[PDB]
Design a protein that fits this description.
about 0% strand; High mobility group protein B3; mainly alpha; transcription; about 80 residues; DNA Binding (I), subunit A; 3 helices
Protein backbone atom coordinates (compact mmCIF):
# COMPACT_ATOMS: atom_id res chain seq x y z
CA UNK A 1 0.00 0.00 0.00
CA UNK A 2 0.88 3.69 -0.06
CA UNK A 3 0.87 6.35 2.66
CA UNK A 4 -0.73 9.53 1.36
CA UNK A 5 -3.19 12.09 2.71
CA UNK A 6 -6.71 13.40 2.09
CA UNK A 7 -7.70 16.95 1.19
CA UNK A 8 -8.96 18.29 4.51
CA UNK A 9 -6.54 16.39 6.74
CA UNK A 10 -2.92 17.61 6.60
CA UNK A 11 -0.25 15.73 4.65
CA UNK A 12 2.07 13.39 6.55
CA UNK A 13 5.64 14.60 7.23
CA UNK A 14 8.59 13.20 5.23
CA UNK A 15 11.11 10.71 6.61
CA UNK A 16 14.87 11.10 6.88
CA UNK A 17 14.93 8.67 3.96
CA UNK A 18 12.62 10.74 1.77
CA UNK A 19 14.07 14.17 2.55
CA UNK A 20 17.31 12.76 1.16
CA UNK A 21 15.63 11.13 -1.84
CA UNK A 22 13.95 14.41 -2.77
CA UNK A 23 17.25 16.27 -2.36
CA UNK A 24 19.15 13.70 -4.42
CA UNK A 25 16.40 13.35 -7.02
CA UNK A 26 17.55 16.54 -8.79
CA UNK A 27 20.97 15.03 -9.54
CA UNK A 28 19.64 11.68 -10.75
CA UNK A 29 17.22 13.53 -13.03
CA UNK A 30 20.11 15.76 -14.12
CA UNK A 31 22.50 12.84 -14.63
CA UNK A 32 20.22 10.33 -16.36
CA UNK A 33 18.44 11.26 -19.61
CA UNK A 34 14.72 11.25 -18.91
CA UNK A 35 14.97 8.64 -16.16
CA UNK A 36 11.71 6.82 -15.45
CA UNK A 37 10.25 7.30 -11.97
CA UNK A 38 10.72 3.57 -11.49
CA UNK A 39 14.45 3.88 -12.16
CA UNK A 40 15.02 6.79 -9.78
CA UNK A 41 13.18 4.84 -7.09
CA UNK A 42 15.47 1.83 -7.40
CA UNK A 43 18.48 4.13 -7.09
CA UNK A 44 17.26 6.20 -4.13
CA UNK A 45 16.29 3.16 -2.08
CA UNK A 46 19.85 1.91 -2.48
CA UNK A 47 21.58 5.25 -1.93
CA UNK A 48 19.70 5.48 1.37
CA UNK A 49 20.92 2.15 2.73
CA UNK A 50 24.42 3.04 1.53
CA UNK A 51 24.51 6.10 3.79
CA UNK A 52 25.89 5.66 7.30
CA UNK A 53 24.17 6.10 10.67
CA UNK A 54 26.18 9.33 10.85
CA UNK A 55 25.02 10.54 7.44
CA UNK A 56 21.33 9.99 8.17
CA UNK A 57 21.71 11.63 11.58
CA UNK A 58 21.29 15.13 10.08
CA UNK A 59 18.58 13.68 7.83
CA UNK A 60 16.48 12.19 10.63
CA UNK A 61 16.61 15.24 12.90
CA UNK A 62 15.12 17.36 10.12
CA UNK A 63 12.09 15.06 10.00
CA UNK A 64 11.65 15.42 13.76
CA UNK A 65 10.80 19.10 13.30
CA UNK A 66 8.27 18.24 10.60
CA UNK A 67 6.49 15.94 13.06
CA UNK A 68 6.09 18.65 15.71
CA UNK A 69 4.38 20.84 13.11
CA UNK A 70 2.16 18.03 11.82
CA UNK A 71 0.83 16.70 15.12
CA UNK A 72 -0.44 20.20 15.91
CA UNK A 73 -2.34 20.34 12.62
CA UNK A 74 -3.52 16.76 13.08
CA UNK A 75 -5.03 17.54 16.48
CA UNK A 76 -7.03 20.61 15.48
CA UNK A 77 -8.37 18.68 12.49
CA UNK A 78 -10.12 16.19 14.77
CA UNK A 79 -12.68 17.39 17.31
CA UNK A 80 -11.48 15.87 20.58
CA UNK A 81 -12.65 18.51 23.03
Amino acid sequence: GSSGSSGNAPKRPPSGFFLFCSEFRPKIKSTNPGISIGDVAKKLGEMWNNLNDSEKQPYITKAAKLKEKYEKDVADYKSKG
